[PDB]
């Protein structure tokens, strides 16, 4: 299976939809119908053409200003790669724990030496007791 192709297709579709929303929402953004080119009616048809933005203009701007961040988060979540292919922060943890256990072993050996010194010195004192 090749999911990278599906991810690239989804990204291309999202980019194309964003470009279309940026382009298909400029039919009345750069003009206000200064002239009456409607051969049918300019008072009852042209007035309803712009008052019907919810069905004509705002029908794309609604999802066009909502699907952007949604698709961004979707793409950022579906692909949580963490795939540097080397796992940079792995050998660091290894060295950290190795130094930790090395210092622990050193402290244990030093404590062993101290305890043996105390014992051997006390065993000589143990001989002194004639009882």
């Amino acid at each position: 299976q090749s999911k990278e192709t599906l991810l690239q297709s989804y990204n291309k579709r999202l980019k194309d939809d964003i470009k279309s929303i940026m382009d298909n929402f400029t039919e009345i953004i750069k003009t206000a119908k200064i002239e009456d080119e409607t051969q049918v009616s300019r008072a009852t048809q042209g007035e309803q053409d712009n008052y019907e933005m919810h069905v004509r203009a705002a029908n794309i701007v609604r999802a066009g200003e909502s699907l952007m961040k949604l698709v961004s988060d979707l793409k950022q979540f579906l692909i949580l790669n963490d795939f540097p292919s080397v796992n940079e922060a792995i050998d660091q943890r290894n060295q950290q724990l190795r130094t930790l256990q090395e210092e622990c072993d050193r402290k244990l050996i030093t404590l062993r030496d101290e305890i043996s010194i105390d014992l051997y010195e006390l065993e000589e004192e143990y001989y002194s007791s004639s009882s």
């Binding site: 949580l80 963490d82 065993e123 001989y127």
Partner: protein
């Protein structure tokens, strides 16, 4: 713009517990990578070197409306608790035990890792009933492995689920490490000559025609034998120390005895220095 700068400004102000790109990576980058059966990613089963038995992982991220709440990934469900009181005699085991017991997700994770570890330990050691039944009589029923080198004390250190002589701590770590040691010895890469993909000692058969003794010593046994030898050595050293220290009490007017033990005692090997040490004299060391 308000919905963008209000619902996504969580990590922009202060990094808090949030499964969205802020919490799932912390455990991932520390434990596993992206995997999906349904929503399960990177089960901790030691299958990289286990080769004993497989177990899946019921893991699934979740959210909740609260203050300081992480993803709380789900999870065997048990626990382990080891305590050693091995001095007794019984005709039949089967009773209960004496049970007496922060990144919560990580706590659950490490608890599952530990319970799987002890499960694998018991599975490996359990494979010792059917064996060469000689010089080591032993019985096993349920989580208990009773044994006796000679009738002086008890055995079968064990554990159980949750929901004086300090022979308690340094009895479990050895058998615990035994598993990873068996993994290591049968895994650091060979690299014998170019890539025959074998073992170093095994490859070394060529350079020297080792005797049958070394041929046998190439491999070795494990499990029950090691723990039995360890317990025998321990109880024997204890009895020897007891006898030596009691000798002084039993004979005081007689020339006393000084005690001196080594500073480096091997697993199986050890040494003790003992002198006559006549009282009030130093020129009697003969």
């Amino acid at each position: 713009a308000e919905r963008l700068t209000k619902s996504v400004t969580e990590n922009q102000e202060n990094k808090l517990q949030r499964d969205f790109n802020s919490e799932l990576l912390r455990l991932r980058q520390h434990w596993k990578l992206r995997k999906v059966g349904d929503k399960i990613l990177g089960d901790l089963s030691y299958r990289s070197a286990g080769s004993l038995f497989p177990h899946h992982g019921t893991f699934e991220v979740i959210k909740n409306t609260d203050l300081d709440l992480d993803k709380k990934i789900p999870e065997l469900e048990g626990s382990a608790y080891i305590k050693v009181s091995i001095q007794k005699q019984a005709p039949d085991i089967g009773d209960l035990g004496t049970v007496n017991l922060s990144p919560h997700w990580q706590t659950k994770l490490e608890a599952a890792q530990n319970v799987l570890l002890c499960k694998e330990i018991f599975a490996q050691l359990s494979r010792e009933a059917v064996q060469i039944k000689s010089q080591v009589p032993h019985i096993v029923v349920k989580n208990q492995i009773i044994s006796q080198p000679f009738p002086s004390l008890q055995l079968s250190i064990s554990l159980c689920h949750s929901s004086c002589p300090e022979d308690h701590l340094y009895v479990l770590e050895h058998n615990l490490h035994l598993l990873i040691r068996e993994f290591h010895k049968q895994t650091m890469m060979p690299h014998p000559a170019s890539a025959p993909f074998g073992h170093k000692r095994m490859r070394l058969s060529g350079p020297q025609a080792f005797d049958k003794n070394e041929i046998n010593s190439l491999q070795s046994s494990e499990g029950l034998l090691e723990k039995i030898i360890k317990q025998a050595k321990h109880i024997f050293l204890r009895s020897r120390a007891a006898a030596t220290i009691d000798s002084l009490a039993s004979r005081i007017e007689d020339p006393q005895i000084q005690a001196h033990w080594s500073n480096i005692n091997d697993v199986y090997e050890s040494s003790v220095k003992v002198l006559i040490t006549s009282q009030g004299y130093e020129q009697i060391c003969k």
